[PDB]
């Protein structure tokens, strides 16, 4: 965690239902957006840390 | 410059409306001033606070 | 260690940070496009601009 890795996601269709339909996640907080709303949205990039 | 009293009334009423329109762009502490951003990003319970 | 208590076990963490900008979009949800309409009053959504 002192040397955390960033992946830039770009130029693709996301599908956040692949994430939010899963029970595997011990936490899934969201800020400035709703997790169920994400499939209606668009972004210039997404950064996965 | 003689008709300044009439042009002053026109100017004051214009400045009042231009201030009223500009205040739509202010956030007042919401995530966006655009009401369609709030509704297209947030759930009912979260949007109603904003 | 695999015998650790639930607070001291490892967790994989992924943070997704979302870039909302004036720039064009390059990541979007799976929602399908549809035909353009002109001169009528219509409801619209361009890249999440409802």
The technique is cryo-EM
* Tokens found for residue A29: 């907080």
- The closest alpha carbon to A40, from C18, C44, B31, C45, belongs to C45
Q: Provide the shortest C-alpha distance from residue A48 to chain C (in Å).
A: 5
How many angstroms from the chain centroid is the CA of residue C39?
Answer: 31
Candidate from A11, A40, A43 with C-beta closest to C19: A43
A46's enclosing H/E stretch is: strand A46-48
Resolution (A): 2.8
Beta-sheet pairing, C27-28 with A12-13:
parallel
Candidate from A32, A37, A41 with C-beta closest to B43: A37
Residue B49 at interface with chain A, using a CB cutoff of 8 Å: no
* Tokens found for residue A2: 């002192």
């Amino acid at each position: 965690v002192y040397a955390w890795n960033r992946k830039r996601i770009s130029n693709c269709v996301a599908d956040y239902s692949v994430l939010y339909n899963s029970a595997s996640f011990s936490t899934f907080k969201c800020y400035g957006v709703s997790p169920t709303k994400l499939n209606d949205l668009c972004f210039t990039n997404v950064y996965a840390d | 410059s003689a008709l300044g009293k009439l042009q002053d009334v026109v100017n004051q009423n214009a400045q009042a409306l231009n201030t009223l329109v500009k205040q739509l762009s202010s956030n007042f502490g919401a995530i966006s001033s655009v009401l369609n951003d709030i509704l297209s990003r947030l759930d009912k319970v979260e949007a109603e606070v904003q | 260690q695999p015998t650790n208590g639930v607070g001291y076990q490892p967790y994989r963490v992924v943070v997704l940070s979302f870039e909302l900008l004036h720039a064009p979009a390059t990541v979007c949800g799976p929602k399908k496009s549809t035909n353009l309409v002109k001169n009528k009053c219509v409801n619209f959504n361009f890249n999440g601009l409802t």
